[PDB]
């Protein structure tokens, strides 16, 4: 409780969908942008905190709350744009005669400031007397001892709470969410989004040799002509979809109504038939 850890992760792929197939997390209250639309959102600095509290105290982890753990143990600012994850941990964090392996601070002079970890343990103070803190009644120990017994119903059981501090500040991001990778459709004009590069064309197999660091490719007219597949290292070729101009051959309305169609810039395949130059 008073020694909540902080293992900041950066420059990695964060797929939050893995947390759904885990133990039931009936505390996913994302006080932020969107809990659903979360994988398609990159983050800059994500700070993952962790602590274990009781059941009736999980509602104090929201941004802005009173109580004992939200004012002297772990207080969140009213700007937290993230998610809170908690689940019942009474299956492995509750033993006979009480689990005394979780200590929570009870007596603190002032309210805890945003993002402060009070690792020190000094005896509380009093009035006109300098209590050192041996056995004094007027003074008391700041930390207490949780009694996590399986003899308690929903509310007094341990709940491992883990939050993710999404900064979302304007800066070069490092933690980007994963994106799906559909199967490649070769020799068929479609849309492609290979590493941000958008456009349409007929993806084919090229014969040029790129350098190990060169990802994209260009031509003499500043047009993406070849890009390597991010999944499998292979040189592809980007030729745009088959377009061209149409010119109608009409012998005059006063003579007849039959017309001929000329598809300029095609080989009679990307459409009597007669191929001209």
């Amino acid at each position: 409780v008073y020694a909540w850890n902080r293992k900041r992760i950066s420059n990695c792929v964060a797929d939050y969908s893995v947390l759904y197939n885990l133990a039931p997390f009936f505390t996913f209250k994302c006080y932020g942008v969107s809990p659903t639309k979360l994988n398609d959102l990159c983050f800059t600095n994500v700070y993952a905190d962790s602590f274990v509290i009781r059941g009736d105290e999980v509602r104090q982890i929201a941004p802005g709350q009173t109580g004992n753990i939200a004012d002297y143990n772990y207080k969140l600012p009213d700007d937290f744009t993230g998610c809170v994850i908690a689940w019942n941990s009474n299956k492995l964090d509750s033993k006979v005669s009480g689990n005394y392996n979780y200590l929570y601070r009870l007596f603190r002079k002032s309210n805890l400031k945003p993002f402060e970890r009070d690792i020190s343990t000094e005896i509380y103070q009093a009035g006109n007397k300098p209590c050192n803190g041996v056995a004094g009644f007027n003074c008391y120990f700041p930390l207490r001892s949780y009694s996590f017994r399986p003899t308690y119903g929903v509310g007094h059981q341990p709940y491992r709470v883990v939050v993710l501090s999404f900064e979302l500040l304007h800066a070069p991001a490092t933690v980007c969410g994963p994106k799906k990778s559909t199967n490649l459709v070769k020799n068929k004009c479609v849309n492609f989004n290979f590493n941000g590069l958008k456009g349409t064309g007929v993806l084919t197999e090229s014969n040029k040799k790129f350098l190990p660091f060169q990802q994209f490719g260009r031509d003499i007219a500043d047009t993406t002509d070849a890009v390597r597949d991010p999944q499998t290292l292979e040189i592809l070729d980007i030729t745009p979809c088959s377009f061209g101009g149409v010119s109608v051959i009409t012998p005059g309305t006063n003579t007849s109504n039959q017309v001929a169609v000329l598809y300029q810039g095609v080989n009679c395949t990307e459409v009597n038939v007669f191929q001209t130059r």
Partner: antibody
Amino acid sequence: QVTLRESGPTLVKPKQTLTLTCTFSGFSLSTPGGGVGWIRQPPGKALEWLALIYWDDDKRYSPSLKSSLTITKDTSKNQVVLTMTNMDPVDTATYYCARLTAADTIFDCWGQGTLVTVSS
Amino acid sequence: ALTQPASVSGSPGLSITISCTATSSDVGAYNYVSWYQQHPGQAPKLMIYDVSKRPSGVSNRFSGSKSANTASLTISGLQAEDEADYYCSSYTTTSVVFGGGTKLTVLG
């Protein structure tokens, strides 16, 4: 799978200290939520819990008997040892050591039983 | 502690229930309750823990529930290899009670 075997001298002198051990194999005691306990079963009676140890050196004993029940862990060789003093001719029973996998699974896998008949 | 019926009879094919009463239940909410089976001459093996669920290796004949404060073991489809003692166990405030015994006598 989990193999919980017992050992130690079944017959001993009265008013002594037993050394009933419980050699466990097939799992690691360092798992969070794990532990090995001890259950007594008198002939023609029901079960009764005596002691229980955990993965964080916590030794939980029965509230009735606390001056004699002393359990210890030897995970270095994987052999849980239980010691009890003041042996009276009422404790003659088949002892079992069962693994407590978690809070919901209360002693899923049990041992085989070692009868300790020591009265006179 | 926990009290259990002494003798329970059941016809082959029918279903019988056990009673694990409160008896000054210091267990509190009575969340976790496990039932064991001990044949004469063997070691007690777990049959059903967390009565809302069942462990692996146990057939669908074994099931349990707890309406308010009493856990019941519903055993359907009785056979000849079922006459054994059952024990309901929970977590008390200072120990782990195992309750009494329940002998099943399948006649016929």
